[PDB]
Amino acid sequence: GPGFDYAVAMAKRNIVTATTSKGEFTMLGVHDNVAILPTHASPGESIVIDGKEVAILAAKALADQAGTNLEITIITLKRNEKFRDIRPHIPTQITETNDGVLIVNTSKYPNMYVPVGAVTEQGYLNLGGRQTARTLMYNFPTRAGQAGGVITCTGKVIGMHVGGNGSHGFAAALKRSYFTQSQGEIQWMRPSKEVGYPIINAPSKTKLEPSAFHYVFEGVKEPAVLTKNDPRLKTDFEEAIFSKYVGNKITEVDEYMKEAVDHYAGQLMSLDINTEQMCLEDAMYGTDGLEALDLSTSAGYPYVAMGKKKRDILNKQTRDTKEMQKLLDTYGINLPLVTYVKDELRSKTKVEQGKSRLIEASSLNDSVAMRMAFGNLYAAFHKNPGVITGSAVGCDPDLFWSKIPVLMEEKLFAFDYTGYDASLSPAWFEALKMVLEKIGFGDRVDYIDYLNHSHHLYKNKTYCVKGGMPSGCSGTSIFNSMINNLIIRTLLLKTYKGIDLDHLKMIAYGDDVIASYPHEVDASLLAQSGKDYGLTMTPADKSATFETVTWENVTFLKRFFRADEKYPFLIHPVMPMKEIHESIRWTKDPRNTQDHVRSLCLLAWHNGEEEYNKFLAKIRSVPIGRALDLPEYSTLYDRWLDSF
Amino acid sequence: GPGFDYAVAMAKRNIVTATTSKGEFTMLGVHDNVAILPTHASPGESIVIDGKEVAILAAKALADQAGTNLEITIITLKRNEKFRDIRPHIPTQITETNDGVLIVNTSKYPNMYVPVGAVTEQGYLNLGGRQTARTLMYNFPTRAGQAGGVITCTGKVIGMHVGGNGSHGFAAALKRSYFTQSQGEIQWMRPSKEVGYPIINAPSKTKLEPSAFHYVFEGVKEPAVLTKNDPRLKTDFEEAIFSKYVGNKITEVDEYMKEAVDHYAGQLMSLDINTEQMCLEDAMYGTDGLEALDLSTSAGYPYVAMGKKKRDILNKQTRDTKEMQKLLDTYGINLPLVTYVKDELRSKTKVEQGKSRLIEASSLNDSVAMRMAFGNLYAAFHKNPGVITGSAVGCDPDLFWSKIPVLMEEKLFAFDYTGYDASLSPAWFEALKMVLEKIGFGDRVDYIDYLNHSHHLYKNKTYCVKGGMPSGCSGTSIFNSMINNLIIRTLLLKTYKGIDLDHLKMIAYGDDVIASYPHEVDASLLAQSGKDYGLTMTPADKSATFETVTWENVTFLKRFFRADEKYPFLIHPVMPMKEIHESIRWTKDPRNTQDHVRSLCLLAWHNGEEEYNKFLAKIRSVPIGRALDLPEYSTLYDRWLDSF
Ligand SMILES: [Zn+2]
């Protein structure tokens, strides 16, 4: 029989003998360094295993939702001893079997395998002094000290022996849950050298240095943490940066999402997007509604390991493709994403807690391939920022801010997401595929699969991520925005049952969304419905409670909305000075103070004439500042009126 | 409003004016050449469309399961006129909407868009003389001749206007079903030149020619059809060879399959398979339990277009990998499968009906990569043909036949599949992944995804297949056999509720399976349960009815089981002479008659001494036959006893 043979096979590498201050026990090694044993076997600071001492990093007792004991403790051993990951053998729920086997192994009961027959649920048990729950009953005169032993059946490890009453034997039922699941973070990981890929170099030291205005203005942000030994860290870094991946919350597209899909794909058809493919040249060198390949960003794999930038490939005015074509025929597509730590400014917390953001750069091949595939889709969205596309990607706030309120419905609502790009369950990509599918792109939905399921080359490792939207791929913003559209709809449909999406007016830019409806909706109620779809929603502008969003307090890019005094329907996109002060204090190339400070003024002046003058006054309080060619308020304000 | 704008957008390219002998009607073009119109608009042999005559290839009326009229006819136009595929806009079920729009367009009612408000189900209607079903009711004084018009709502095309009663308007509800779905065959297809890939050459004329024994023996098989113009064909060939893909029947792994999974993965652990990776060299040049790369088979993409065989890459005794490594780093993996028409012998029917089998060759890169990935798994299965692996792949019938009946349970059952490899729903691969996942290979389940979702380069086209097991990839046999194991279990579990899989004894070789259980099961009942999982099962040996399988009639490879007269427990694998007669009559290289006829004798002699002597006698009735070095019965029979 294979049930017996199974019991032996599991035991051969996942069952060991453990000695506590309360005798020998059979112990199931569940995964890595995690093993379980009966609670009454009170684990101490250390423990004797197959001959010698092993320390306990930390132990955990187990109880249920009622507080009732489960009679299971999950200890953690301090050693390089890796158990076979046998979590998958543990059932997801309390399992009964008509032909179970008790596995015990101590110096008192060596290699014991008992055919205990039927294994049914006992429910509530009253085991010596301490009442227990989630137990299984098998009718076999279980003797003392067989505790710890495991109960299996062909292909399943269902219970842990914890006791008996002379006639019967009892075991605490085992469930997958009980061990932090491996469906999140990463799917699998391992040494790049073991799977053909090469090691990725990464600048260790940051390229952000204090600017000429570091003391002129105040600020608290600092360059993000970039290596393991940054003394500013207050936690393990490796662990901290990967804690972004939270793993799939859902797989299936439910009715709400399908109808969210139907409606939004529906809206996109009034746009009459050109469902053709985009020629290589246009995808590369740009066309109407689409800027050429960004030369700043990385070239990705395998172009980084071969030392070859995007500049060395493109002929800006020659507009030559031959070079790029030969590459696409050679290295194909669907290539691993190179992963860098994003070198940027971060808050006091996100430095201490190592929350440095990661860059996953798509290979130039994918990059170009997806532009040929979705180029026309992108151009459509860029030439149409609004409430049809539901996208603000490509907009020009100086001008677009005056249209937004016209486009918006009567009662605004909005909220903040928390690690949006990574919280996107594979179910949302399928939803996204469906939308394409409906607007005449079902032809190349395979590319979304590429975004959902992607392997990354981190530094020393390669790993595959099943879920979440990568950060450095073509279309990222638009696809995130489109996905966002699907989400708001889904949540509205589920919360406010029988809503009317045709009066949903919203605009997204990635995770950022400004929405509206003729009736005031409850952000709170939605944020809850959000949990179910694996999304973490909190009140807009990092606010304490969910409050009513007004035109006086809503913010759409990091900017506010304020009417002009001379023309009540011209709306200034007001960027808070604090953000500008932060940014001006650091620089990655002090040969651009002119372009950098310039760019900031174009944001700062919408703060009012009184404000913007102080700002220049301060820039001009130091030599590098006075020697700068900066626009006066009128020059800008005047130009801004002719803008429209 | 976007509901209105939708109605217009759909109409712009999917609504046209059609004139029958009974006036003008609004007509919805649904996809390709398929369009619908009201039944009472009685379509003739031709029809006037936007100005001129268009012939009707064929028309179809529609009724329901009761026979009741639906008032819809789906005509087919004879022209290069492709409608936008808008099947996805059609809901899957009878849809109601609170805000519908009637779209009409004739010379009498140009560009008509009526906000008909709420659209509810009428159920049974009594429309002028002919009672109708699946109708929708909207309260708007619909006037005569607005029939044909469509009813939409944001993102959905839900009904076809068919009439009214003065106060209300009625429409036959639309459903996706109504148009042969596009979830099968192929997922998408199109010109290789449009997606970088090159054209694939294919020998037009067959390499099978009559052998020296074509008239000596009798037979009816012939070389398979290989090109469009073979005069033997009785149907369109292109269409006929692709009719193999039947499209996904299921996506989700249900409880029966998960438990089939649990049990079988369970069994495989007694084997203690080496869950490591296999070094490149062994994966390439062979090791214990694994033969080296097959040099006969194709090199695949892009090695075929570059004109470079596997021989020019491998150093049989040098065992050099550098050459292969540099290739894997260059062209990566997960490459399209090159598709050839398998040049083989076929029956009278399968020639007439163009059912020529297709070869989808995996790139040598995938090929080697999967051997490194699953090499150890394969070796385990080859060194263990039996009822543990549930696999006969790698067995040596001359010897293995005597073990099979010992290994088998007491009551045999078996059946035939129909296009098994292609009927495998994506749900079965997920199940397969789970099995790996449990036996310590979850680490490289991505490779199964490669088998499930694969693009092929046919000749002039590239297309992606979502579902079904490709024919020329590494592990095909083993993975098909493992999948088969999962299926039998699933069907047993669902039919004979509360079965006991530990007394299931079976052995598979691809789709071929010989199974048993202590109780006689009903193949019939199982074949039915099979339908639900997208599988087509019929009685074993192309038999008329499902009968009781006995040792006297069961067949496991194309061979029967017959005990030896001198040793009742030695079992001859008896290959039917007919198969041998067929095979001997053709050859692809007449410089091998020696090796070919030889090989046949090693099969033929288990048919008995009287038989095998006639067989030589006939081979030796012609010059090319007498001049052959062929083994006598004793020589073989004697050797066969020392075999074991
Ligand atoms: Zn992966």
Ligand SMILES: [Zn+2]
């Ligand atoms: Zn595909």
